[PDB]
């Protein structure tokens, strides 16, 4: 199973790299930046 | 009888827009720091 183990390791590494390339924390950070920008644009402090 | 308007004004000016802006800034700081998924921890967990 040396070849089987090597192929499994390669597949696992490819899956890990794909997940690292397609992350969700970057999307969450971008969304939080958008929310902060919208809050600053609406200027809640001036309204209150 | 005269203390009631004075107490009402003290309540109004104590909880003025200063506290509102302070709490808004606290919430923004928590969102920008505490409410952020650190990709560093994600990558450390993936590598481990």
Key attributes of the depicted protein:
part of a larger assembly; 2 chains; 48 residues; mainly alpha; rod-shaped; Apolipoprotein B-48 (chain B); lipid binding protein; apolipoprotein; Apolipoprotein B 100
How would you summarize the topology of this molecule?
This is part of a larger assembly, with 2 copies of chain A (48 residues).
Chain A: H1 2-21, H2 25-42, H3 44-47
Descriptive notes:
Chain A: This is Apolipoprotein B-100. Chain A: It is found in: Cytoplasm; Secreted; Lipid droplet. The structure is cut from a larger assembly and holds two copies of chain A (48 residues). Chain A is rod-shaped and about 70 Å long. Chain A is built from three helices and no strands. In chain A, 88% of the residues lie in helices and 0% in strands. Chain A has 48 residues and is mostly helical. The first copy, chain A, has helices at 2-21, 25-42, 44-47.
Q: Quick gist of this model?
A:
Chain A has about 50 residues and is an all-alpha fold. Chain A contains 3 helices and no strands.
What is the straight-line distance between the termini of chain A? 69 Å
Largest interface (C-beta under 8 Å): A-B, 16 and 15 residues
Largest sheet of chain A: none
Counting copies of identical and different chains, the oligomeric state is part of a larger assembly
Shape of chain A: rod-shaped
For the secondary structure, the number of strands of chain A is 0
Strand fraction of chain A equals under 5%
Query: What's the SSE pattern of chain A?
Result: HHH
SS summary, helix count of chain A? 3
Helix fraction of chain A, binned, reads over 70%
Protein name (chain B): Apolipoprotein B-48
């Amino acid at each position: 199973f040396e070849r089987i183990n090597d192929i499994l390791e390669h597949v696992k590494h490819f899956v890990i790299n794909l997940i690292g390339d397609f992350e969700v924390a970057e999307k969450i950070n971008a969304f939080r930046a958008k929310v902060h920008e919208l809050i600053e644009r609406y200027e809640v402090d001036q309204q209150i | 009888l005269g203390k009631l308007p004075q107490q009402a004004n003290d309540y109004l000016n104590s909880f003025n827009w200063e506290r509102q802006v302070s709490h808004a800034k606290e919430k923004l700081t928590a969102l920008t720091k505490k409410y952020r998924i650190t990709e560093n921890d994600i990558q450390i967990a993936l590598d481990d």
